[PDB]
Amino acid sequence: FQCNVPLGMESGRIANEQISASSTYSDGRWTPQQSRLHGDDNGWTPNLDSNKEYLQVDLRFLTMLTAIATQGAISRETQNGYYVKSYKLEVSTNGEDWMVYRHGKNHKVFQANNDATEVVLNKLHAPLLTRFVRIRPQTWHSGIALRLELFGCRVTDAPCSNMLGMLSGLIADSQISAS
Amino acid sequence: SHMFQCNVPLGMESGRIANEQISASSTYSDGRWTPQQSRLHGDDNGWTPNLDSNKEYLQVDLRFLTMLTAIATQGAISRETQNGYYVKSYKLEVSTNGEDWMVYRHGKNHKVFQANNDATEVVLNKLHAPLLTRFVRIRPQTWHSGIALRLELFGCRVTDAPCSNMLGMLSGLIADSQISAS
């Protein structure tokens, strides 16, 4: 068993309804639902280019996240290339409290895309328990544009013993940090 | 109606924790206060170290990965002298791997548990949240007359509880420490 499965952005297993954003570009051609990896109709772009903007996926089910893949997008209408160069990850299990994913105790800035087309895969140091995932762009080229895939496995849909071990492992790790 | 609960005695009183699983930094030089005598409600003294100091500890190897949720302690009455001894406060130190030890913490500081006020009565300390562990050390901080401990641990074995429940409990704990990081 391996907890690396595509969570359903490219396949459509993650429904349109599960994808939202802080805002979207005003012409309606850059909706959150166009943020699927390898999608051929632009991507997600906010109403404004800022680090306050984000793309949100509701995974519904309690999920171990192990990787993130991102692209930028090429504009269908203008043929300009846009891409996020670095982002933060923000997660929640309850939908009220949000944790910015951390390297130790610092915000983890993920190095993202160098062009509008190539997929860039970031593996997490360790699985991250979550239900909601926000990608928060920090730097970008020409403008914010995102396509996305999430990788891992569903907590109630993995072999019990493997998951039990994975979860025990994570709790032991945080305890080791407190040594 | 069968309701799993993670508050079960882990085996100090019952014998399920073997003599071999119990150890200490040291033991009283007359050999009458061994670690193996630190079982809750035991009538043959208790555990006492060679020296009375906060550097001394009683250790339980639980062997199996365990959720600790509660600690119960007593002091001890001496069979030989009829003197009463008891630990008044203690710190708790745990480990999952045997090498890295975490002192149980209340916020930023070491948690100092309030313990016994006599040699006979059981004082129960419930943990705010279940603690994953494999080894337990009780580190006495203060005492009356000298350090003597009897002990019980409460909780559940990780692989001995229903999967669904354990999956939820472990997820719960991770979600809680995530909330602590906002």
UniProtKB/Swiss-Prot annotation, chain A:
Biased-composition ranges, Polar residues, are 24-36
Q: What are the disulfide bonds?
A: 3-153
Map out region (Disordered) in residue numbers. 24-43
Q: Where is the F5/8 type C domain?
A: 3-153
- UniProt subcellular location: Membrane
Entry remark concerning the domains of this protein:
The tandem CUB domains mediate binding to semaphorin, while the tandem F5/8 domains are responsible for heparin and VEGF binding.
Assigned protein family: Belongs to the neuropilin family.
Physiological role: High affinity receptor for semaphorins 3C, 3F, VEGF-165 and VEGF-145 isoforms of VEGF, and the PLGF-2 isoform of PGF.
Assembly and interactions?
Answer: Heterodimer with NRP1. Binds PLXNB1. (Microbial infection) Interacts with human cytomegalovirus proteins gL, UL128, UL130 and UL131A.
Question: What is this protein's name?
Answer: Neuropilin-2
| Chain's gene name | NRP2
From Swiss-Prot, chain B:
Family of this protein:
Belongs to the neuropilin family.
| UniProt-reported outcome of changing residue 63 to C | Rare variant; may act as a phenotype modifier in EIEE13 patients carrying SCN8A mutations
- Domain observations: The tandem CUB domains mediate binding to semaphorin, while the tandem F5/8 domains are responsible for heparin and VEGF binding.
Q: Which domain of life is it from?
A: Eukaryota
Q: What is this protein called?
A: Neuropilin-2
Q: Kindly list the cysteine pairs connected by disulfide bridges.
A: 6-156
- Give residue spans, biased composition: Polar residues: 27-39
| Cell compartment(s), UniProt | Membrane
Question: Which residues does the UniProt record annotate as the domain F5/8 type C?
Answer: 6-156
Q: Which organism is it from?
A: Homo sapiens (Human)
Q: What is the effect of changing residue 157 to W?
A: Rare variant; may act as a phenotype modifier in EIEE13 patients carrying SCN8A mutations
Spell out the residue ranges making up region: Disordered: 27-46
- Output the lineage of the source organism: Eukaryota, Metazoa, Chordata, Craniata, Vertebrata
Report the protein's function. Answer: High affinity receptor for semaphorins 3C, 3F, VEGF-165 and VEGF-145 isoforms of VEGF, and the PLGF-2 isoform of PGF. (Microbial infection) Acts as a receptor for human cytomegalovirus pentamer-dependent entry in epithelial and endothelial cells.
Give the record's subunit note: Heterodimer with NRP1. Binds PLXNB1.
